[PDB]
Amino acid sequence: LSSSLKTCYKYLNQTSRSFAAVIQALDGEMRNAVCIFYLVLRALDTLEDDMTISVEKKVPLLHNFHSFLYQPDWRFMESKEKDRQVLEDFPTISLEFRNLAEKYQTVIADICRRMGIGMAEFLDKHVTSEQEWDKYCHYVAGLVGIGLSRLFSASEFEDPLVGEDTERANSMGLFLQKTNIIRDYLEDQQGGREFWPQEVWSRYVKKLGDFALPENIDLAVQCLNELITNALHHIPDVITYLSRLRNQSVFNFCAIPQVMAIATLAACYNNQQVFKGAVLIRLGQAVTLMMDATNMPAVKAIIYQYMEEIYHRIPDSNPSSSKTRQIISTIRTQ
Amino acid sequence: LSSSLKTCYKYLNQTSRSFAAVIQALDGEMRNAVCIFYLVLRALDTLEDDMTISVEKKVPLLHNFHSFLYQPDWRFMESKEKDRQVLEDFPTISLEFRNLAEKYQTVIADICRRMGIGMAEFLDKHVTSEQEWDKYCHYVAGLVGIGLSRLFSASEFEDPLVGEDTERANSMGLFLQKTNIIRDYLEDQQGGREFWPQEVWSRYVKKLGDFALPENIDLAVQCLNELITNALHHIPDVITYLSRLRNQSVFNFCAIPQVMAIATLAACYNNQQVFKGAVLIRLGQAVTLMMDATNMPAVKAIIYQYMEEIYHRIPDSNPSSSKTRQIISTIRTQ
Amino acid sequence: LSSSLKTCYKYLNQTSRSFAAVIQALDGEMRNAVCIFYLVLRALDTLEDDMTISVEKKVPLLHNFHSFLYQPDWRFMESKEKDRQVLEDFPTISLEFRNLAEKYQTVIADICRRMGIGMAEFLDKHVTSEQEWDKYCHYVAGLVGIGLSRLFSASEFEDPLVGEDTERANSMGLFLQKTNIIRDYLEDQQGGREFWPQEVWSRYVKKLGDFALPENIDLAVQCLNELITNALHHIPDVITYLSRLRNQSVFNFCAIPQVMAIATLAACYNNQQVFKGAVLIRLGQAVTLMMDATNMPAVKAIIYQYMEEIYHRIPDSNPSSSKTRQIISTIRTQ
Amino acid sequence: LSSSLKTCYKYLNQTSRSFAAVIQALDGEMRNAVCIFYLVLRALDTLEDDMTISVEKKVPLLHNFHSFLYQPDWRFMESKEKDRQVLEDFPTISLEFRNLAEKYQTVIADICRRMGIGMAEFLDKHVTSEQEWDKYCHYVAGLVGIGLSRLFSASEFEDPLVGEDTERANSMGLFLQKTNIIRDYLEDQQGGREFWPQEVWSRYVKKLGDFALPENIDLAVQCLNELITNALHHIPDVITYLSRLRNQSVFNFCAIPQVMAIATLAACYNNQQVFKGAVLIRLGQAVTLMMDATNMPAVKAIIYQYMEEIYHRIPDSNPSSSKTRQIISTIRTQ
Amino acid sequence: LSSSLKTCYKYLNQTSRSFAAVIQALDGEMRNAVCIFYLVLRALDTLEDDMTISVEKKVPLLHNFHSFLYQPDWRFMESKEKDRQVLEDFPTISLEFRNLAEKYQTVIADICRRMGIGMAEFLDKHVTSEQEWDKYCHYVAGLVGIGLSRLFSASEFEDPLVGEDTERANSMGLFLQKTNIIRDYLEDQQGGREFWPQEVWSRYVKKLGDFALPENIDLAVQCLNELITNALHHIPDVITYLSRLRNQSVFNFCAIPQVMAIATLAACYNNQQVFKGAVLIRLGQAVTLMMDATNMPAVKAIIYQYMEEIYHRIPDSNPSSSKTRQIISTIRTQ
Amino acid sequence: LSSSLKTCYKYLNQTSRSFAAVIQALDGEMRNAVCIFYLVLRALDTLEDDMTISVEKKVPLLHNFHSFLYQPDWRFMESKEKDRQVLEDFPTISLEFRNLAEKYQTVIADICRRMGIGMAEFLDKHVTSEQEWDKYCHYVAGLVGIGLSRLFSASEFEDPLVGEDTERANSMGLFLQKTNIIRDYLEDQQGGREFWPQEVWSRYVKKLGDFALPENIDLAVQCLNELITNALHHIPDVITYLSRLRNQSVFNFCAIPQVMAIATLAACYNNQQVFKGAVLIRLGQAVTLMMDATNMPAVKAIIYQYMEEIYHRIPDSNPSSSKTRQIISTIRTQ
Ligand SMILES: CCCCCCCCCC[n+]1ccn(CC(P(=O)([O-])O)P(=O)(O)O)c1
């Protein structure tokens, strides 16, 4: 019907290779709510990425983005980023945002407000400590998990307990983000962006860029393995979060991406290829090829299979070997 | 128990490459009702297929087929087709037909009667307009969908609405038949049959067979895309139909073929391979590799994913490009 | 919490390539109960396998194994088998066994007692009759299915009937054991172990080992098909058992191995490769690659498909051909 | 099966009028856990109650009571209290405690250690301030609510948030205790124990025992009303707590006592009978006489009705009148 | 939060002795929506009540009441009725009305309009025919059931069919209103209000008020029984309606009142007390004393028991004996 | 609609003091199916009760009763029993029976047959051993439970596992029957019928009627307790049976009768009143007066409370005492 809503779903598919389908498969009111949430977040993220926008011009844009949702004519025409159209045709997006029930608007605007402050905070600095890593990931992904959880509950398709558990919801976002940051080292490196925590990579090399030098491959993998081990600590929370869900369309939406990130970490673990090029995500063992990620018991088994894929490859010599076995042990035994 | 019922199930597995498994997995009374229904339709389809049966003899056979279901000793012994066994031993099958609850008999006979009349009508002509294309598919597949739907409701395993909404049920069949007709262009051409609507292909070449000529590949593909674009229009109905199902065994039976057809059309889209041989039914992206077609939400996501696969390949120079984008856009927004 | 329980799960993953994942996915109490059960069975199985332990020395260990579960310090340090770790660190396993609720201990201890008795029984004899084959399989697998079934009922996650029907539960074990025995012919031969029932292979050759000879390949496949035909008889019971399950985690745990077994039999049927090396278990038709083994209707479909995969490869000449067709027919018509 | 567990349930019934039935009705694991938890707390409570034991001998016992749980032979044979049997045959109870899953053991032991510390602390003093009243109630009731919530979560029959939100769990306990303390004024005076906050009753009389004086009945009722108004403040939390529950057996166990407590408070409100004898708990209005406390909405309705029963009888002349009306309004509106 | 909303709930508990509790127990948005709806209906009803308000001054107030919802300052200070508080502080109510999601406002406003119209229409006449009785009940209660039903569907806590089947919803209001009109005969007569249909009572006496004269007690009871029999015809629709509800909080809200109405009719049937004083609503047999009205099957059982309580007390010589038996027979059999 | 069906429901209410309401509350096809099943069962029982019918005339009526269901004009106008109307108007009943789906007919027919056979057998003898007592109860109550269970499963409102479990369905029946037999001793004696197992009452008195003698009150009570103790042994099965149920209407129907019987036994236990006059069924403690029997945990709680009510009154001086405690402790610990 609505031509503007049509445009939004067009944008959703243009900017989301890996979420559009599951988003469109969401039950009732969640469909549009999550679609709109994805688009405005996409716009806020594009603003953050655009390095052609000076920091002093970017801070206000990020700080006041949540208010733009209520400015019918607001738009940004100076972006040179690839997803710039959601910024250039933002009026069509904010229009549909204002068409959403108020309970959804409140959540989306709140997350944008907080995300903007968070992104602005890290514009002038690099992630140093692992604690700072969690903070950054909390700002660009954790809040997304929290926001989404609140939309699920406000829609009534999910229990109020889902949106209430902000800790676990934050973990869902932290896990996906860390996995992406780890996987995209080379890509981010070649792009002038540094996301790997400094207090970690500085124990291996002088400059993050050195992991890009073939003569430092050994040290690079060791660091890679330490970061992966860090990310695995979020899996217990992920499993707890998914176990609470009761709506199938919501379960598929939340589970598939977590399982893909896990498959991603398994393929990247102790993999020199992370620093040479792209890594191929292989489908799995025999038991996995018999199930898919659409029921909780099956999701656990698929995760456990991937954990052993890793556990099996842990080199006694890796300086994170014990930590890696420990967290995988915890995941198995829980 | 019954040896004749056993023989029936033997013939089902011998004559149904892709439906036998799901049919045998159907709950209660539906199992036998659908088994027999499949057997008589296959027998009817074989009569129509056999080019060694003169039109003079064929017309009466197709018109009166439905009544043979009531004649204990009727059988045909002159078929040369591969599945002739269901015809030569029709008494065994007709015997089991008469054992079904009267309510299922009504549906089965009614569909055979209408289908036979329909097949007789197309013995002396080819499909011309797109309207005739729908009419033809209605007779050989649409009615099959209507029949099955009415059986589902009659058995009470599915809501009355399932059997009542004949339009949606018809679409389910039309989508599969059109998809198969598109896929099998080359196999049918070498077989002496023409199913592609003449009013569509005549606007590209002079004879349908011209598409098999390496020098016409481009026009051939433009026609392929137009027809695929025609088939895509049934998807909203397929989704509506599937979303109404409540029985797991019925859901698997109905959803599996649909998703298969959809992946098939995605693989054929703008693919020149359609005119050189058989086409690869890929595997999917990552989001799909983690989902199977057993719950509505997952099916929607898989369908939406295949829709994007097609959307990504729509060349701007294709004369149907705008139409193809249009229908996909509607499927996303609904 | 407990580090001993963690060690147990470490052992589970070290000794079980294909069960660990689905075992860890079991709901609540069944998780640790099945884990521990798997581990004690594995310890008992290892003692049994060890050919460096004389029969006189071995018998008392098998007979009293169930009692060692209550000897806090008991362990066995003289094994050279691959999984000896579970025997050498048995106190860690029995400690957790004694932590399980008493109702579970009773079931596990009872199965261990009866299994040791049976295992002792066969230390000095080979399998002769087919009836002896069922008894041996009952001892090393059938009882496992009965034990597990009693754990499911006692946990209340499954109906009281699952545990009470020892016959259906027994068939579950027999089917997996027979399938493995059939598949591992060559590996067992080169190991000095013989499990194919003598009365069956003797009607084809003088020494079971002759099947390993290239010149007897024809008689080999014939024996292979007769045994496979024997195994198929448990499938009706397998299906009955699975259709009573109501817990999803227990369903995945029970269904997946049975399906893998069936896929294996289909692959081995009329295959010379069984006598030359490892057999490649391949994908499946189209209808199967669309579904996974996590819902009863889908499992039925998957099974029916493999049945037809065997059925239509049955050589007219084969001595069992008519037996094979008859059981498959019974499986479909039920 | 085991007579020691049978014996435990025997003691559970001898020592609990209003809990034994609902406790035995708890699903799976929670049954024995809560049963044992109840028995040990009853044993601890019996020691504390016994004025026959000297303070310097009682303190160490209360402090180390948690440790006896691990001492197979520990037992107390010098008590004169009615429920002395649980102390005399503690080995039976501790044996079963040690048979519970470790996760339950640590929760129970932890609560017993903390409860003992608080109990010892209040041996030589009475409740002065209202803040002290919460503290005393925390030690003898709040912690039980926290302990039970942790057990519910650990059993997985309830959400992780139930065991995490110790504040809400605490309120469940404080509400029941305060109510009982308010109700049992007379009974306690005649027993030599003082539980009404001195800082509260002191503003009305000179000695708590004066409310027992006919001539002071009016000051009494006013103090009664002030304390009840204090208790009514835990209701919002009680509603928050009960709203998170998803297991019916746990819901019954938690909701029934809360509702009875609220009925008791409504009956005692501005009732002189409190200072004369036992107060009878009425029938409830018409709306409540068609609803039982087994589903949250019904429980809410029941609670709201009792709130009105109290709101209707608030005397303007009462000094707490405004406060009372306020808390009720907050409960109504949330 | 909002002090105005707080005030609204205070008035709800002031003006509604029997709906306040279940309204406050409604889930999410239905809570405030229904509370406000009740308040505005109460104000409209109180205007209509005030005899101190001349006809030509009242008619406008009734017709334009639906508009005062949007007049921020609108308020009436000349009422003497007991619930005058809601008219004097109407802006507070109207304010909260405007805070509701428009989809709710739309429903409420539409009902207040159609209600004021009908109310106006009856200001100068009495109820003559039975058809006119239905019309009057439609206006003061039927429309209410429609409005509430439409609020439920718009909240989506209930299926769309609920707000769709206006006839069934109308029946809900008609059953309650008739029951109350029957029950409050004396109270209404003493107030100068006559709601019993003249075409029914004039067959017994000359003036409806004569039923208040002890000498006409027998005739009064006969008429009483005729009207009750009339009311019973709405029961089939009440059961149908309730059976479609899916939200527990909505079910309690709807079922409790209906069950209390049926119990009231049962107590009033062939009961002289109706004309002497008030009637006590009876416990219930033994089967009912074992269930509450919170689940459909239980509600049906309660309803059937009350029908039998009536059926057994039907006097053969009663003028409606056959009609009464007929409808109760219809109810049992459906 | 059907006037014959209406008449059927009139007889249900006429002949069934307690079950009518809950039977009419059953979902869909179970309603009529169970109503009709109750009527035929009542007719068949009335034939048996009629002592004016000679044994040689009675026997054939019983054995062939099951065939009368298909004999349209069959009826019996010679009964003097109070419920004779069901026999005289049997054609109305047999008519509606034949309107029931064939699946329901089979069960009812099958049950009547087997029940008639069993009733004939006991026409000339008395219940001797307790094993005989179970046999009799099996024929007049147990089979009813087996039938109902099958009707539930056949209707598909209850899982197939309910119909299958015959031993527990039997226990359900045996418990009610034994309970009524124990309660109606006096009434059965003054009626010339003896049902207490001779082998048990013979160890107390010479003639079962002696218990009616005030001089044997002590031996009477003792015998009473020994029988009640006997009955209690069915409770574990009763609890297991109900725990399996999933449909609410079926649950109320099954649960309520069992709770009443339990309450009955509780009131009768060690109560002389049994031999003097009608026994009264008490309220039930505080906790129970808070729950109804519509959810399994509440039912367990109710049962457990009544069990305590009996355990409390077990006199050490009784000779069954140990047996009584033993069984109750088992019902509690399981
Ligand atoms: C599967 C749940 C039901 C299993 C038991 C079904 C048979 C019950 C046998 C007891 N029985 C015998 C006579 N009655 C009639 C009973 P009623 O219809 O309420 O008059 P009651 O006189 O109250 O005991 C019941």
Side-chain angles (χ1 to χ4, degrees), chain A residues 1 5-6 9-10 13 17-18 21-22 24-25 31 248-249 252 256 259-260 283 292-294 302, chain B residues 285-287 289-292 294-295 297-298 300-301 304-305 308 311-312 329-334:
Chain A
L1 298 165
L5 186 69
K6 246 193 194 59
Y9 274 101
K10 185 180 75 184
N13 281 286
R17 63 185 105 147
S18 41
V22 283
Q24 297 179 177
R31 196 178 201 269
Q248 189 68 66
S249 69
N252 289 3
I256 273 56
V259 172
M260 284 162 61
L283 290 56
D292 51 271
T294 61
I302 293 180
Chain B
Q285 195 219 58
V287 175
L289 299 185
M290 312 289 7
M291 313 183 93
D292 70 329
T294 55
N295 58 82
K300 278 185 179 180
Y304 292 139
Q305 245 190 310
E308 287 312 304
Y311 192 99
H312 297 333
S329 169
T330 283
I331 299 176
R332 297 165 167 172
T333 310
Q334 299 178 320

Side-chain angles (χ1 to χ4, degrees), chain B residues 190-207:
Chain B
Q190 291 163 174
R193 288 97 49 193
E194 287 201 351
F195 295 117
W196 283 30
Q198 174 267 135
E199 269 185 18
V200 173
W201 64 253
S202 79
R203 280 188 281 103
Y204 293 93
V205 281
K206 287 162 67 78
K207 306 220 252 81

Side-chain angles (χ1 to χ4, degrees), chain E residues 45-93:
Chain E
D45 177 83
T46 295
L47 291 175
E48 196 257 54
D49 279 355
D50 214 352
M51 300 312 290
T52 307
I53 306 173
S54 46
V55 172
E56 96 279 11
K57 190 196 181 190
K58 178 177 294 183
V59 181
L61 290 173
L62 296 179
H63 280 117
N64 312 317
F65 188 77
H66 73 143
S67 73
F68 309 143
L69 299 173
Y70 297 118
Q71 284 186 43
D73 308 290
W74 193 91
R75 60 96 127 314
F76 190 80
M77 301 300 285
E78 288 99 55
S79 183
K80 310 309 297 181
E81 299 300 294
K82 92 164 202 289
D83 306 311
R84 59 185 183 182
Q85 179 79 297
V86 296
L87 285 168
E88 310 194 326
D89 188 18
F90 199 82
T92 290
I93 297 176

Side-chain angles (χ1 to χ4, degrees), chain E residues 80-329:
Chain E
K80 310 309 297 181
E81 299 300 294
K82 92 164 202 289
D83 306 311
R84 59 185 183 182
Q85 179 79 297
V86 296
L87 285 168
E88 310 194 326
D89 188 18
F90 199 82
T92 290
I93 297 176
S94 59
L95 171 54
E96 282 307 318
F97 165 74
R98 296 189 286 279
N99 276 312
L100 297 173
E102 276 193 47
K103 54 174 181 173
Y104 299 137
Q105 288 182 39
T106 294
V107 174
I108 292 177
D110 181 54
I111 297 301
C112 288
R113 179 181 63 77
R114 300 161 66 184
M115 192 166 301
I117 287 183
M119 294 194 152
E121 169 183 346
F122 276 78
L123 275 184
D124 60 351
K125 66 169 173 179
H126 288 102
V127 184
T128 56
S129 57
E130 288 186 284
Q131 166 174 293
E132 276 276 294
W133 197 30
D134 285 355
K135 188 166 169 181
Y136 178 72
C137 288
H138 171 82
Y139 297 148
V140 310
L143 287 178
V144 175
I146 293 169
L148 286 167
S149 285
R150 275 159 52 179
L151 281 181
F152 300 149
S153 283
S155 75
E156 287 165 300
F157 278 110
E158 292 307 324
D159 213 84
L161 183 66
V162 171
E164 262 180 50
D165 189 332
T166 45
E167 193 50 41
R168 267 41 185 279
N170 184 63
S171 290
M172 286 293 275
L174 258 55
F175 186 69
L176 294 181
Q177 193 57 39
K178 284 183 177 177
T179 291
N180 291 160
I181 281 167
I182 290 182
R183 179 200 65 189
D184 305 320
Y185 162 78
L186 191 70
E187 183 185 303
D188 286 313
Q189 190 56 54
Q190 297 176 177
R193 308 183 297 283
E194 299 181 353
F195 301 115
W196 285 31
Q198 176 267 125
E199 284 197 25
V200 164
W201 64 247
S202 77
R203 276 188 275 90
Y204 299 93
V205 285
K206 300 189 175 196
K207 286 175 295 166
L208 171 57
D210 300 326
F211 283 154
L213 300 171
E215 67 248 34
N216 302 310
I217 199 56
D218 298 271
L219 289 167
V221 169
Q222 286 185 147
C223 185
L224 170 60
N225 294 344
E226 199 182 330
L227 296 181
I228 285 168
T229 299
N230 175 301
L232 296 181
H233 288 72
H234 296 305
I235 289 181
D237 272 20
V238 170
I239 294 181
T240 286
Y241 181 99
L242 296 172
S243 66
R244 291 173 178 169
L245 298 181
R246 299 309 172 204
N247 178 288
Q248 186 71 68
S249 74
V250 173
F251 185 90
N252 288 1
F253 170 83
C254 295
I256 302 322
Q258 299 294 312
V259 162
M260 272 157 83
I262 295 177
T264 293
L265 287 192
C268 290
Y269 184 71
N270 203 57
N271 187 350
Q272 258 165 38
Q273 264 301 99
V274 172
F275 308 102
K276 298 196 202 303
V279 182
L280 292 190
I281 306 315
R282 263 211 249 157
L283 295 147
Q285 203 212 60
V287 170
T288 178
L289 293 166
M290 211 71 265
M291 20 178 55
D292 70 6
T294 60
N295 63 81
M296 203 59 220
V299 173
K300 287 186 183 178
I302 289 168
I303 290 181
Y304 296 137
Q305 288 194 299
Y306 278 125
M307 292 302 98
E308 293 303 300
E309 172 162 319
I310 291 179
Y311 189 94
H312 283 306
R313 312 210 304 260
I314 302 178
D316 278 271
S317 89
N318 187 87
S320 306
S321 55
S322 284
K323 300 182 179 182
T324 305
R325 294 192 176 86
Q326 185 193 303
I327 185 58
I328 289 183
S329 181

Side-chain angles (χ1 to χ4, degrees), chain C residues 14-15 42-43 46 79 81-88:
Chain C
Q14 306 190 333
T15 59
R42 176 39 118 282
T46 296
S79 177
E81 293 303 296
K82 184 200 65 221
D83 304 306
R84 58 186 166 102
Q85 172 84 263
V86 300
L87 285 172
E88 298 173 6

Side-chain angles (χ1 to χ4, degrees), chain D residues 7 12 58 73 77 80 82 125 129 158 212 215 218 258 260 300 306 317:
Chain D
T7 300
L12 174 68
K58 182 178 290 186
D73 315 319
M77 309 294 309
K80 299 305 301 176
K82 63 161 184 168
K125 65 173 175 178
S129 52
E158 292 298 349
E215 71 244 48
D218 292 7
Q258 291 302 315
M260 280 169 81
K300 277 178 173 177
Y306 277 122
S317 27

Side-chain angles (χ1 to χ4, degrees), chain F residues 21 64 70 128 138 210 214 235 237 264 267 282 296 303 309 314:
Chain F
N64 314 333
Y70 300 105
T128 42
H138 173 77
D210 304 337
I235 293 182
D237 280 5
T264 291
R282 140 160 79 233
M296 199 61 231
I303 295 183
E309 271 229 65
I314 300 181

